[PDB]
């Protein structure tokens, strides 16, 4: 706000207009990034008083209206673990209380209606039957859920409990979000500290230059400060344009994980966490999103003898969906991702030619029901 | 808005157009309060003064001068100042100041001027050709004159060369005027270099005695122990002002504060060197200096092709400091606050949006995220679609920029 | 003889309040863990600037002389405490080469379980003095724990200095070096810890 | 005087090429996505939710546009839901049947 | 390694240090890229003889 300097800054023309226009491009993009991640539902779905979900306990990830704003228990942990010279910071368009209504809506749709709320109107389905479809989506037969439902619910409830213990005891997972806060703070600190630099001028303060000197010498001394301070903004705006492209690549990724992991069951290996993907739940965090990816990880292997096909009445039989195995004395067909042995039959198998062609075929009775 | 966008027609949106800034209401100038004034007045009231052939350099140091109390005053039988306007003397600084001082006859006071000729100037006390300083003189015929003549006051008149600027020579030794060696005694060819005034009360006003101070100055490599006088002003709180404390200038809002300053601490800084508190040197309270409020003025507009109605957002400014309506984005003016939420037409911030609607006016509202829906969920209920709709959905993706090439030499040098 | 200075001898480099913050600054400071000279008077060089400390309450350490000549060929800085007040003068003194107790002039100024500590430097025509007083529990050798030294005076003496001497259980002498320090300020506006950036790789 | 103009005109031109490189990286990210939608939506049928428009994807048709591409994503959207009582299994001769 | 030049370069303030910090960001990111591509396997699996 020195008028002597402002008359010199007019001689540089359009540079200040394009610096403001570049930062306005950054600023609108942050709202559009936030819109593309969270605002994927046309309707704010919500969850009934009958919390009856087959033994699964979502109370750590759903809202509780007793809290400060409509955040879940885990969203409150995530909101704890992340923490004036013509510079201004603007508010986001959606407040954290609005992001928490979108993550609640996405989660209430996911629990009550599966993937159906992503394809059309939400269709209700019982939660144990939604998990039966999600088990069937990873090639495990749906009876393997229903015959183990209490075990599967207790493993899930235990695993959500470990997420609270993790987020209560270590910050290190949120290093991604804290680094994004720290970089913007460090860039603003550096931009402000550069007001104190001389750039070869007699002094860093405009009134000091103006007080000491002949107007024509003072003009030449101020044009150094204008050159240095303008190069200081052009350095900062270039860093922010690159940093916004880095964040936008992560917003496009988060918008894709919302669509594919939450609104569906994407089969893309190690996209929605390690193991076979069952479902995931979004939770808000300061400047980001957190996905709790729920996955089926196989355990307790047994070694078996195996064969590509088996002979019968000279006919060669191949397994219709499973794989052939033997315990050493008897031959069975099992599904592939979980040991469940069945007797080999004329309707567990299909025939193609005879025993001559297949390498490593074996001999056993196929039962004909 | 039209000037910011360089266009006569403006489409719907929110546009930043200029910055608002609270103006300084007054100037505050807190030097240390006016103390240790230089003792010029004590010299002006001295009981006696030096004989001019033997004039005295009375030292002044470690004090603030004021020449304005002098140049405004008729209190002297003669007053003069040189080299600068009298108004400029109160801006000067020096390592030492002096009352270069003596008794002379009234007719000779006018000899004391920059580089000028005269018996006092050329043989007793010489000013340089561009001297900056003042001459102060007053009649002393009531004390320095005596019956039969007071001979104790004398000036030099005869010398082998005239004085250089500030040159000094107290010698009473015989002036040899010819071939005769004088042997330390007066005689033919062997005269006194001084003339006594012989002051008497019966003499006319120009041959009466006058007591004189020449205010006379010295700046060396050593610090300026003397300067012209500090200003002072009153002080006021919770208003934007231009300010100085000692030499700490700024524009800001002065406020009462709890910062635990140690006795020597003059001011306080934030993490980014931002000075944000001060000790007032005229009353030892601690003032927090808050910035004067400023922010981007954004203009919120429908398409000008539909109406000239507009609203204004003052980003981060409280409406107390600028229909009128406070928001967490800042003060909003010219828009109706409506309690029914709608989809966001024009964005503002922190859940607020605005639109032009029904008779029509700009309205502002908390935006609506979507229709609420209680899904009919229970442990044994399922919904199945009995029909379908095929849907065709457009999606548009950019793939290429306009291919550009620039001759940098023709652009730069034409 | 010599002794380790530990964290001693850090002073407020500017007359500024700072709260719950770390500030990095370059000036003349006493280096951490430096070998300060130990004494039970000699004439000593001034170098860039001086740190002085003593175990005292008897005023047998009456003060100091500073100058170039230390004698009446030119102006000399004399500091004396008379046990009622401190008096300071710059005149061409010709006082003793080794004074002890009875038990032109251009400027003038007027102001064991106890450890008393002081710092002196001259810049461009001003003389700077800083000081602190504290209890200590140890017999001899300086306390390892931190405390800061506070500015007294900014005397417009004009003269330069190249040497100094003490005026008659221990006293300690250190020399400042141009150093970068990180200074830790508490919530109440005071320095309470520091890092000498050139001390070691962890400090850097 | 000319060295002042060369300094300004060169800084003006460096600022333009810097922002065209960043804008070109933004358009490359969009051209990689468009090439991926061509490969996965047009040449195939994607099971990736929302990737080829809303609803379950059937097919899409590319249409050109100046400096871009337009995909007409044809999707099946389920409609007119009835709601029914359901069970995970059905019990026959003391044995559980699953669909 | 000129002292007379280096004392002038300090008057430009953070323009030197933030470029060393930017190229350090480039350099560490190359190891992050190489980790994310190859370190997807939790054990060094080996083929039988
Ligand atoms: C399977 O058989 C091999 C035979 O060498 C043995 O090393 C291995 O421990 C067995 N179990 C599993 C789970 O691989
Ligand atoms: C293999 O399975 C059959 C049926 O479970 C059983 O009778 C037989 O004893 C098993 N053989 C071994 C070696 O466990
Ligand atoms: C299985 O592998 C062994 C060598 O590891 C080999 O001797 C045997 O012939 C193989 N089986 C068949 C069906 O060839
Ligand atoms: C399977 O049975 C045929 C005769 O039906 C015999 O030739 C063949 O060797 C048998 N193969 C094995 C692996 O026992
Ligand atoms: C001058 O300033 C001091 C220190 O702020 C204050 O104590 C004193 O009352 C002031 N005196 C007058 C006459 O204003
Ligand atoms: C302005 O409004 C008129 C209403 O008829 C419409 O035809 C026109 O497309 C609008 N836009 C411009 C740029 O005139
Ligand atoms: C605005 O100023 C008034 C002044 O009384 C104050 O009460 C209020 O808290 C300030 N902030 C807002 C958001 O109104
Ligand atoms: C709008 O709601 C506020 C409380 O949120 C209330 O004070 C105000 O009177 C309401 N205005 C109208 C027109 O209903
Ligand atoms: C179907 O859903 C509606 C809406 O919730 C409910 O009123 C009705 O009782 C349900 N009927 C059956 C058979 O589930
Ligand atoms: C299915 O919807 C179409 C319109 O989309 C309608 O013409 C048709 O009659 C409907 N069929 C049934 C069985 O409801
Ligand atoms: C210098 O310092 C070290 C560590 O304080 C000490 O061991 C050594 O005796 C000292 N040497 C001298 C010459 O003072
Ligand atoms: C800071 O100052 C307050 C003044 O009331 C004092 O009570 C407090 O103990 C001080 N803090 C420390 C850490 O000494």
- CA A224 – CA A205 distance, rounded (Å): 12
B138 is written with which tokens?
A: 């007053």
Contact between C30 and C148 (Cβ < 8 Å): no
End-to-end Cα spacing for chain C: 30
**Main-chain dihedrals φ then ψ at residue E18, nearest 5 degrees:** -70, -20
SS3 C15: coil
In this structure, the residue with its CA closest to atom 3 of ligand 2 is: A330
Contact between A87 and A104 (Cβ < 8 Å): no
A273 is written with which tokens?
A: 């966490």
Strand order in the sheet with C114-123: C2-4, C35-39, C171-175, C50-55, C114-123, C126-135, C148-155, C10-11
SS3 A355: coil
End-to-end Cα spacing for chain E: 59
**Main-chain dihedrals φ then ψ at residue B315, nearest 5 degrees:** -60, 120
User: Degrees (nearest 5) of the Cα angle B403, B404, B409?
Assistant: 160
β-partners of residue B190 are B176, B187
Which residue of chain E has the CA closest to A191? E14
- CA A274 – CA A295 distance, rounded (Å): 7
A42 and chain B: CB distance < 8 Å anywhere? yes
CA-nearest of C203, C130, C188, C179 to C26 is C179
- CA A22 – CA B335 distance, rounded (Å): 28
Q: What is the 3-state secondary structure (H, E, C) of C37-102?
A: EEECCCEEECCCCEEEEEECCCCCCCEEEEECCCCCCCCCEEEEECCCCEEEECCCCCCCCCCCCC
How many CB atoms lie under 10 A from the CB of residue D74? Answer: 18
How many CB atoms lie under 10 A from the CB of residue B179? Answer: 6
In this structure, the residue with its CA closest to atom 1 of ligand 11 is: C35
Contact between B14 and B298 (Cβ < 8 Å): yes
In this structure, the residue with its CA closest to atom 5 of ligand 10 is: B389
Residues in Cβ contact with B39 at an 8 Å cutoff, skipping those fewer than 6 apart:
B60, B63
Q: Is the dihedral of CA B352, B354, B358, B361 positive or negative?
A: positive
- CA A281 – CA A110 distance, rounded (Å): 8
| Residue A11 DSSP one-character state | G
Contact between C12 and C130 (Cβ < 8 Å): yes
Q: Which atom of ligand 7 is nearest to the CA of B328?
A: 13
How many CB atoms lie under 10 A from the CB of residue B381? Answer: 14
C106 is written with which tokens?
A: 């251009």
β-partners of residue D65 are D68
Contact between A18 and D15 (Cβ < 8 Å): yes
Output b/e per residue, C89-125; b: 16+ Cβ within 10 A.
bbbebeeeeeeeeeeeebbebeeeeebbbbbbbbeeb
Pairing of strands A315-319, A349-354: antiparallel
- CA A130 – CA A133 distance, rounded (Å): 5
Contact between A279 and A294 (Cβ < 8 Å): yes
Contacting residues of A for B314, CB less than 8 Å apart: none
Selected for mutation to probe chain B from A29, A36, A45, A131 (highest B CB count within 10 Å) is A45
- Which residue among A303, A328, A330 is best mutated to probe the pocket of ligand 2, counting the most ligand atoms within 8 A of its Cβ? A330
Q: Mind telling me how many Å the CA of A178 is from chain E's nearest CA? A: 16
Contact between A158 and A165 (Cβ < 8 Å): no
Contacting residues of D for A123, CB less than 8 Å apart: 78, 81
Q: Is the dihedral of CA C155, C158, C161, C164 positive or negative?
A: negative
**Main-chain dihedrals φ then ψ at residue A58, nearest 5 degrees:** -90, 5
* DSSP labels, A336-349: SSS--EEE-BTTTE
Task: Name the residue among D15, D79, D88 with its Cβ closest to that of A132.
Answer: D88
- CA C127 – CA A289 distance, rounded (Å): 60
Q: Cα E28 to the chain's mean position, in Å?
A: 4
Contact between C92 and C75 (Cβ < 8 Å): yes
- CA C193 – CA C203 distance, rounded (Å): 13
Phi/psi-derived region of residue A347, left when phi > 0, alpha when psi is between -120 and 50, beta in every other case? alpha
Task: Name the residue among D47, D55, D83 with its Cβ closest to that of A124.
Answer: D83
- CA A67 – CA C83 distance, rounded (Å): 67
Declared resolution, Å: 3.3
Residues in Cβ contact with A239 at an 8 Å cutoff, skipping those fewer than 6 apart:
A187, E22
SS3 A285: strand
Residue A319, CA distances (Å) to A135, A363, A368, B22, C13 in order:
21, 14, 15, 82, 85
B186 is written with which tokens?
A: 């007066």
Residue with tokens 């401190």: C86
Rounded to the nearest whole angstrom, what is the distance from the C-alpha of residue B333 to the centroid of ligand 8? 18
Contacting residues of B for D13, CB less than 8 Å apart: 406, 408, 411-412
- CA A57 – CA C188 distance, rounded (Å): 49
Q: What is the 3-state secondary structure (H, E, C) of chain B?
A: CCCCCCCCCCCCEEEEEEEEECCCCCEEEECCCCCCECCHHHHHCCCCCCEHHHCEEEEECCEECCCHHHHCCCCCCEEEEECCCHHHHCCCEECEEEEEEEEEEHHHHHHCCCCCCCHHHHHCCCCCCCCCEEEEEEECCCCCCCCCCECCCEEECCCCCCCCCCCCCCCCCCEECCCCCCCCCCECCEECCEEECCECCCCCCCCCEEEEEEEEEECCCCCCCEECCCCCCCCCCCCEEEEEECCEEEEEEEEECCCCCCCCCCEEECCCCCEEEEECCCCCCEEEEECCCEEEEEEEECCCCCCCCCEEEEECCCCCCCCEEEECCEEEECCEECCCCCCCCEEEECCEEEEEECCCEEEEEECCCCEEEECCCCCCEEEEEEEEEEEEEEEEEECCCCCCCCCHHHHHHC
Contact between A181 and E1 (Cβ < 8 Å): no
Contact C156 B225 (CB under 8 A): yes
Pairing of strands B311-315, B330-333: antiparallel
Output the CA torsion A15→A17→A19→A23 (10° steps).
-170
Residue with tokens 């039957």: A129
- CA B100 – CA B54 distance, rounded (Å): 11
Q: Mind telling me how many Å the CA of A222 is from chain E's nearest CA? A: 15
B218 is written with which tokens?
A: 């010295």
Contact B392 D10 (CB under 8 A): no
Contact A95 B351 (CB under 8 A): yes
Contact A245 D22 (CB under 8 A): yes
C176 is written with which tokens?
A: 């400042």
Pairing of strands B63-64, B226-227: parallel
Q: Which atom of ligand 2 is nearest to the CA of A327?
A: 1
Helix (H) or strand (E) holding E9: helix E3-9
Ligand index nearest the alpha carbon of residue B261: 12
SS3 D88: coil
Rounded to the nearest whole angstrom, what is the distance from the C-alpha of residue A142 to the centroid of ligand 1? 29
Rounded to the nearest whole angstrom, what is the distance from the C-alpha of residue A320 to the centroid of ligand 4? 23
A118 and chain D: CB distance < 8 Å anywhere? yes
Residue with tokens 């493993």: A155
Contact between C58 and C83 (Cβ < 8 Å): no
Q: Mind telling me how many Å the CA of B362 is from chain A's nearest CA? A: 19
How many CB atoms lie under 10 A from the CB of residue A32? Answer: 12
- CA C116 – CA D62 distance, rounded (Å): 87
SS3 D84: strand
Report chain E's C-alpha Rg in angstroms.
Answer: 21
Q: Is the dihedral of CA D24, D29, D33, D35 positive or negative?
A: positive
Q: Provide the CB-side half-sphere exposure for B386 (13 A, CA).
A: 5
Q: Is C85 exposed, middle or buried (0-12, 13-18, 19+ CB in 10 A)?
A: exposed
Q: Looking at chain D, how many residues does it have?
A: 99
SS3 A129: helix
Q: How many helices (H) and strands (E) does chain E have?
A: 2, 0
Contact between B170 and B56 (Cβ < 8 Å): no
SS3 A183: helix
CA-nearest of A267, A364, A275 to A319 is A364
Domain ranges of chain C: 2-204
Q: In terms of DSSP H, where are the helices of chain A?
A: 3-9, 15-38, 73-81, 96-113, 116-119, 127-137, 143-146, 149-169, 175-193, 206-212, 215-257
Contact between B61 and B275 (Cβ < 8 Å): no
β-partners of residue C78 are C65, C89
CA-nearest of C95, C44, C76 to C160 is C76
Task: Name the residue among B21, B349, B369 with its Cβ closest to that of A90.
Answer: B349
CA-nearest of B171, B109, B106 to B144 is B106
Contacting residues of A for D78, CB less than 8 Å apart: 116, 119-121, 123
Q: Looking at chain A, how many residues does it have?
A: 369
CA-nearest of A232, A246, A230 to A176 is A246
- CA C189 – CA C185 distance, rounded (Å): 6
Pairing of strands D68-85, D56-65: antiparallel
- CA A296 – CA B319 distance, rounded (Å): 56
Q: Indicate which technique resolved this structure.
A: cryo-EM
Q: Mind telling me how many Å the CA of A17 is from chain B's nearest CA? A: 9
Contact between B363 and A112 (Cβ < 8 Å): no
Rounded to the nearest whole angstrom, what is the distance from the C-alpha of residue B354 to the centroid of ligand 6? 22
| Residue A59 DSSP one-character state | T
Contact A123 D96 (CB under 8 A): no
How many CB atoms lie under 10 A from the CB of residue C150? Answer: 17
β-partners of residue A349 are A319
Task: Name the residue among A121, A143, A263 with its Cβ closest to that of D81.
Answer: A121
- CA B196 – CA B172 distance, rounded (Å): 12
Task: Name the residue among A41, A86, A93 with its Cβ closest to that of B370.
Answer: A41
Helix A15-38 and helix A96-113, axial crossing angle in degrees, nearest 10: 30
- CA A278 – CA A296 distance, rounded (Å): 7
β-partners of residue B314 are B297, B331
Q: Cα B125 to the chain's mean position, in Å?
A: 37
Ligand index nearest the alpha carbon of residue A329: 2
- CA B138 – CA B78 distance, rounded (Å): 7
- CA B388 – CA A130 distance, rounded (Å): 21
Output the CA torsion B242→B243→B247→B249 (10° steps).
-50
Contact between B30 and B244 (Cβ < 8 Å): yes
Q: Provide the CB-side half-sphere exposure for A271 (13 A, CA).
A: 18
Q: Do the two chains A and B touch, given a threshold of 8 Å on CB pairs and at least 3 pairs?
A: yes
- CA B248 – CA B245 distance, rounded (Å): 5
β-partners of residue C55 are C115
Residue with tokens 């002096």: B98
CATH topology of domain C2-204: Jelly Rolls (2.60.120)
Contact between C105 and C90 (Cβ < 8 Å): yes
CA-nearest of B67, B204, B55 to B132 is B67
- CA A192 – CA C32 distance, rounded (Å): 32
CA-nearest of A100, A109, A102 to A130 is A109
Q: Provide the CB-side half-sphere exposure for B102 (13 A, CA).
A: 24
How many CB atoms lie under 10 A from the CB of residue B192? Answer: 15
Rounded to the nearest whole angstrom, what is the distance from the C-alpha of residue A152 to the centroid of ligand 9? 29
Rounded to the nearest whole angstrom, what is the distance from the C-alpha of residue C142 to the centroid of ligand 12? 27
Q: Do the two chains D and E touch, given a threshold of 8 Å on CB pairs and at least 3 pairs?
A: no
Contact between B136 and B82 (Cβ < 8 Å): no
Q: Mind telling me how many Å the CA of A275 is from chain D's nearest CA? A: 18
End-to-end Cα spacing for chain D: 87
- Which residue among B290, B315, B317, B318 is best mutated to probe the pocket of ligand 7, counting the most ligand atoms within 8 A of its Cβ? B318
SS3 D65: strand
- CA B1 – CA B12 distance, rounded (Å): 12
Q: Provide the CB-side half-sphere exposure for B371 (13 A, CA).
A: 6
In this structure, the residue with its CA closest to atom 11 of ligand 7 is: B318
B262 is written with which tokens?
A: 């140690």
């Amino acid at each position: 706000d020195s008028t002597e300097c402002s008359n010199l800054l007019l001689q540089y023309g359009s540079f200040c207009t394009q610096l403001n226009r570049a930062l306005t491009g950054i600023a609108v993009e942050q709202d559009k990034n936030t819109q593309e991640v969270f605002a994927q539902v046309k309707q704010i779905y919500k969850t009934p008083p009958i919390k009856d979900f087959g033994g699964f306990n979502f109370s750590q990830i759903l809202p509780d209206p007793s809290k400060p704003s409509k955040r879940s228990f885990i969203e409150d942990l995530l909101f704890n673990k992340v923490t004036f010279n013509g510079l201004t910071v603007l508010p986001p368009l959606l407040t954290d209380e609005m992001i928490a209504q979108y993550t609640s809506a996405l989660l209430a749709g996911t629990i009550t209606s599966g993937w159906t709320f992503g394809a059309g109107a939400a269709l209700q389905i019982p939660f144990a039957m939604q998990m039966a479809y999600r088990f069937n989506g990873i090639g495990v037969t749906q009876n393997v859920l229903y015959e183990n439902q209490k075990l599967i619910a207790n493993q899930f409830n235990s695993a959500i409990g470990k997420i609270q213990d993790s987020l209560s005891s270590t910050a290190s997972a949120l290093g991604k979000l804290q680094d994004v806060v720290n970089q913007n703070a460090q860039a603003l600190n550096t931009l402000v500290k550069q007001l104190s630099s001389n750039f070869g001028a007699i002094s860093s303060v405009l009134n000091d230059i103006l007080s000491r000197l002949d107007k024509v010498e003072a003009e030449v001394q101020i044009d150094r400060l204008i050159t240095g301070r303008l190069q200081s903004l052009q350095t900062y705006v270039t860093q922010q344009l690159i940093r916004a492209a880095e964040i936008r690549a992560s917003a496009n990724l988060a918008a894709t994980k919302m669509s594919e992991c939450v609104l569906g069951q994407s089969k893309r290996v190690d996209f929605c966490g390690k193991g076979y993907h069952l479902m995931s739940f979004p939770q808000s965090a300061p400047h980001g999103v957190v996905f709790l990816h729920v996955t089926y990880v196989p355990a307790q292997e047994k070694n078996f003898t195996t064969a590509p096909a088996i002979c019968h009445d000279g006919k060669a039989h191949f397994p219709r969906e499973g794989v052939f195995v033997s315990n050493g004395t008897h031959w069975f067909v099992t599904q592939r991702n979980f040991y469940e042995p069945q007797i080999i039959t004329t309707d567990n198998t299909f025939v193609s030619g005879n025993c001559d062609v297949v390498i490593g075929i074996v001999n056993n009775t196929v039962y004909d029901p | 808005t039209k000037c910011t966008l360089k266009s006569f027609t403006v489409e719907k949106g929110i546009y930043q157009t200029s910055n608002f800034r609270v103006q300084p209401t007054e100037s505050i100038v807190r030097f240390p309060n006016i103390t240790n004034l230089c003792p010029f007045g004590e010299v002006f009231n001295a009981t006696r003064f030096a004989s001019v052939y033997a004039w005295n350099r009375k030292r002044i140091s470690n004090c603030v001068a004021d020449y304005s109390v002098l140049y405004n005053s008729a209190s002297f039988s003669t007053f003069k100042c040189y080299g600068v306007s009298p108004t400029k003397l109160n801006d000067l600084c020096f390592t030492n100041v002096y009352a270069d001082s003596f008794v002379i006859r009234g007719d000779e006071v006018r000899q004391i001027a920059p580089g000028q000729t005269g018996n006092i100037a050329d043989y007793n006390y010489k000013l340089p050709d561009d001297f900056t300083g003042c001459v102060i003189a007053w009649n002393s015929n009531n004390l320095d004159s005596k019956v039969g003549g007071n001979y104790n006051y004398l000036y030099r008149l005869f010398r082998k060369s005239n004085l250089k600027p500030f040159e000094r020579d107290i010698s009473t030794e015989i002036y040899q005027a010819g071939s005769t060696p004088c042997n330390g005694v007066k005689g033919f060819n062997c005269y006194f270099p001084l003339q006594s005034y012989g002051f008497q009360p019966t003499y006319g006003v120009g041959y009466q005695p006058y007591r004189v101070v020449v205010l006379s100055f010295e700046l060396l490599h050593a610090p300026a122990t003397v300067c012209g006088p500090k200003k002072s002003t009153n002080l006021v709180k919770n208003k934007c002002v231009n300010f100085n404390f000692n030499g700490l200038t700024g524009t800001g809002v002065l406020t009462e504060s709890n910062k635990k300053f140690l006795p020597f601490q003059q001011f306080g800084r934030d993490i980014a060197d931002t000075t944000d508190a001060v000790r007032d040197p005229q009353t030892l309270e601690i003032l927090d200096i808050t910035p004067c409020s400023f922010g981007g003025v954004s203009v919120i507009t429908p398409g000008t092709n539909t109406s000239n109605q507009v609203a204004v957002l003052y980003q981060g400014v409280n409406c107390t400091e600028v229909n009128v309506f406070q928001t967490r984005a800042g003060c909003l003016i010219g828009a109706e606050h409506v309690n029914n939420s709608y989809e966001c037409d024009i964005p503002i911030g922190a859940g607020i949006c605005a639109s032009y609607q029904t008779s029509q006016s700009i309205i502002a509202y908390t935006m609506s995220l979507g229709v609420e829906n209680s899904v009919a969920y229970s442990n044994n209920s399922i919904a199945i679609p009995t029909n379908f709709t095929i849907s065709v959905t457009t999606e548009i993706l950019p793939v290429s920029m306009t291919k550009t090439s620039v001759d940098c030499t023709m652009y730069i040098c034409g | 003889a010599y002794t380790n200075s530990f964290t001693r001898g850090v002073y407020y480099p500017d007359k500024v309040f700072r709260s719950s913050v770390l500030h990095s600054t370059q000036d003349l400071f006493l280096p951490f863990f430096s070998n300060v000279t130990w004494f039970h008077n000699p004439v000593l060089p001034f170098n860039d600037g001086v740190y002085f400390a003593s175990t005292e309450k008897s005023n047998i350490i009456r003060g100091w002389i500073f100058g170039t000549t230390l004698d009446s060929k030119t102006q000399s800085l004399l500091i004396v405490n008379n046990a009622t007040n401190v008096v300071i003068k710059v005149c061409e003194f010709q006082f003793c080469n080794d004074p002890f107790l009875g038990v032109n002039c251009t400027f003038e100024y007027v102001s064991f379980k106890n450890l008393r500590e002081f710092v002196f430097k001259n810049i461009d025509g001003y003389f700077k003095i800083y000081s602190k007083h504290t209890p200590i529990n140890l017999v001899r050798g300086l306390p390892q724990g931190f405390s800061a030294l506070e500015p007294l005076v900014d005397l417009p003496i004009g003269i330069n200095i190249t040497r100094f001497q003490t005026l008659l259980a221990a006293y300690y002498v250190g020399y400042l070096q141009p150093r970068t320090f990180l200074l830790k300020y508490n919530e109440n506006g005071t320095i309470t810890d520091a890092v000498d950036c050139a001390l070691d790789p962890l400090s850097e």
